[PDB]
Design a protein around this ligand. Sequence first.
Ligand SMILES: Cc1ncc(COP(=O)(O)O)c(CNN[C@@](C)(Cc2ccc(O)c(O)c2)C(=O)O)c1O
Ligand SMILES: Cc1ncc(COP(=O)(O)O)c(CNN[C@@](C)(Cc2ccc(O)c(O)c2)C(=O)O)c1O
Lengths: 464, 464
Amino acid sequence: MNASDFRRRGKEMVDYMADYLEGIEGRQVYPDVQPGYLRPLIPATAPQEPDTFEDILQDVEKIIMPGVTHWHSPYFFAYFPTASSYPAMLADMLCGAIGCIGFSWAASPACTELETVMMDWLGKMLQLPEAFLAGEAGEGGGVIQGSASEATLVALLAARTKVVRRLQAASPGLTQGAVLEKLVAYASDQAHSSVERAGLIGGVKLKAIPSDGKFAMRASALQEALERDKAAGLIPFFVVATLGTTSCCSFDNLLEVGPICHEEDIWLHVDAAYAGSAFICPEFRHLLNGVEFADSFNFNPHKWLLVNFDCSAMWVKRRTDLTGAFKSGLITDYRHWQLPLGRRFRSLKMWFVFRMYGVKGLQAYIRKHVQLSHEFEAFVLQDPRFEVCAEVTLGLVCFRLKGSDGLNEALLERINSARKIHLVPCRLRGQFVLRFAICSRKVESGHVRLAWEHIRGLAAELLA
Amino acid sequence: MNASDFRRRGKEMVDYMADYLEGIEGRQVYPDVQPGYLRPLIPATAPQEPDTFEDILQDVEKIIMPGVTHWHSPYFFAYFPTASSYPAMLADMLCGAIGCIGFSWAASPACTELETVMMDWLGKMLQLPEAFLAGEAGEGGGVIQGSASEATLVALLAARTKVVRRLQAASPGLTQGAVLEKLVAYASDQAHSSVERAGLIGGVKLKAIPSDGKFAMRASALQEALERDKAAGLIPFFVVATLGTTSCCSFDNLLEVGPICHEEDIWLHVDAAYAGSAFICPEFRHLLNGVEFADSFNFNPHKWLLVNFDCSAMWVKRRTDLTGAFKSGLITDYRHWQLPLGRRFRSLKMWFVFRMYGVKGLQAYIRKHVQLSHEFEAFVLQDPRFEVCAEVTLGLVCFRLKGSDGLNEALLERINSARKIHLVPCRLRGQFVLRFAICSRKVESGHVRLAWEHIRGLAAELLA
Ligand SMILES: Cc1ncc(COP(=O)(O)O)c(CNN[C@@](C)(Cc2ccc(O)c(O)c2)C(=O)O)c1O
Ligand SMILES: Cc1ncc(COP(=O)(O)O)c(CNN[C@@](C)(Cc2ccc(O)c(O)c2)C(=O)O)c1O
């Protein structure tokens, strides 16, 4: 197809996209399709001659949609939200049209330059210490990573290279392999699985630190682990502090963990994938206190800041520490800040979102979700049959029917079978817990109310 | 902004995208902007209140465009092409609207299922051995990687885990670190830098194999290296054969290298980033012969198959070998086939491109570029002042002005300073060479002719 055809089809696609998101409430959130449903519905080979756009769109609706879990439905309360905003979609369109591969400055100056500024803009919205800002003379700076899982691996690799060099500077005949055997990384027992994958890929041992009563990593527990492992001849080199754990959105104590990592010269990476977005609101910023001790900080605007997926934000205090793993002020070589060499103009999404919503719009968005979260929490607190299982700070409420895990697993099955809303569970200290996460950009109090009524009703039937 | 605003702005964006690509020939390919030009032109902070869409679009045109290198201009003859097609853009739009994160089957069945089928469709277009196809009972299969650089690291990690397990089976006290010290990987001296990055990240030694007269890796040179390294107590575990090297688009000999890797039980990964797309044309398929010996095969539809960047295609013969590094028939867990956990619905781009162009349209596209490449080659062969430096098989012509490297470096500077076309050089055996790569989806004979006339003219002035 050509430009004139695109002008026509592109506009049709725009209406199709708007129609989908606009009438999404009428879709069943979770699909009834069985694994393997798709292959028999489409040809086993690509067509020799063109199919029409109309035919493809019909297939999207009749063959693809039945196998889609609608992340953006007001009734999707699973995992954590993923971002969807029209400004981000407009930027993605422009991004694909410009279509440059920013593997070097010369490949498209703006592809690299806009990103550094967007990262400073965002760094300021979060009130990050200046050490993380690029500005005109900063040693630090930020980069867009493809995802938090990748950001963590990047930080682990930078940390691995750094401690290897420190060990080798003092004892030159030491090999990389010999050093790997002694390296140990730590993360909370509530840390996301991306940390274990990073340890596995990095070839190092990863040890979980027992979390406290509020599922937070504490100085005492970290120190205990450090002493035991150093005594055994292991070398702590990397710690991942999680702000906004997946299970119950708890927060590791950065003010306690930071000083320890500093004293032991341990690389401290902060994973705030979900919660990070809330930090642009002054009332939640205290949760990030202690980030001044972090060597790297990361959160996903593609979760809770409306920047469509393919946008994880990472900052470091020393580009040299990051850069050393893959070989001030202005950044010209992002290829040394990430695993892949190529990259597309993703900073455009941030620019459009930040400018079209404005900081105030983004704050209102966060605050509304937190309000909705508390509305759901209030419902649960009013019913003596249920219990809230963890402090509710952001858009996640962990709850359960007072009773056995079997009862709650049954409640979850009833909810999934009903197909009205979609939630997922988790285990908090072996205990089965239901998670209610405010996800959709357009969830309203009504949806939360109906979701609660639906859940309360099923619970009643079950209790009988 | 809301759906109705998007219906309006999205359509405006469509026209803006079409206008840009349509009038791209009137843009200067390479920018005159200096590093750091952007920061002073935009605010140091995000706006508190919304900016208008009109204002953003004006900034795109006045502030962003001057810092963009136009990859899609008919006059961009640098590196290798990157993909840009309207069907791919249409799919990307849909992809962002559905906006699912396919980290598991349940997160969106179709996000995972369509991908496996598209990979089989593409596998069939390339006439890959059936061992690489998923089908209904295959052990192999394909996955979309974010890029070839990542695909190579994935294969290296799978290979690293495989040889480590084989070894610890013989010597169970052998640690991962002890094994890493003995591992050696190989690639041609013409291999892309992504291979060195993979070795660095994987913590293993990478050794370059001298290429022959046609810049191809040969059995003799590989064997020589293997014998020397095994004798030194090193363990070969991974070889990257490159089909379509960046410098001169040469091809490693798979028929020679394959048997050796098989006999030595060395993981053979095939990197065909650019050239891979040509293999859907029967007249170029012989270049891929020997892929039956490969453990993993990869090429980028986002280079030369019109699937907009963020689309690298990788196949393996044994999902178990790949999967083992991150832990038949239907694939439900792509999270064990790649580094990141999340992923978007990228298979949509393949589906739209394959269906809207049809195999025949894709083959016509490839053939036209190869024809244009030979047209340029013919021009060079007619002028006794120049020489072609390597066999021309696909869309790349390596040439130089007969004489010193200094003369050619001067010619390149003249070309870049003129700002009419954009090319990059490379060194072939220390010799400075100019590269002419057919890139744009809309390059025509006229463009190639004008580019040659422009180059010939500058060469004349210089020679005087
Ligand atoms: C605390 C924490 N750290 C890292 C990650 C990985 O982030 P990414 O997906 O960018 O690699 C997670 C993220 N996600 N875990 C979820 C919530 C799944 C999910 C929801 C929404 C998204 O946009 C993504 O990308 C993933 C879980 O269900 O496992 C995390 O929470
Ligand atoms: C032979 C070869 N192998 C691997 C790679 C890496 O691919 P990717 O960019 O997906 O990680 C390359 C690729 N690119 N090298 C180029 C041609 C730059 C480039 C051009 C067009 C693209 O779409 C991308 O992604 C990159 C370079 O000149 O170095 C490769 O050639």
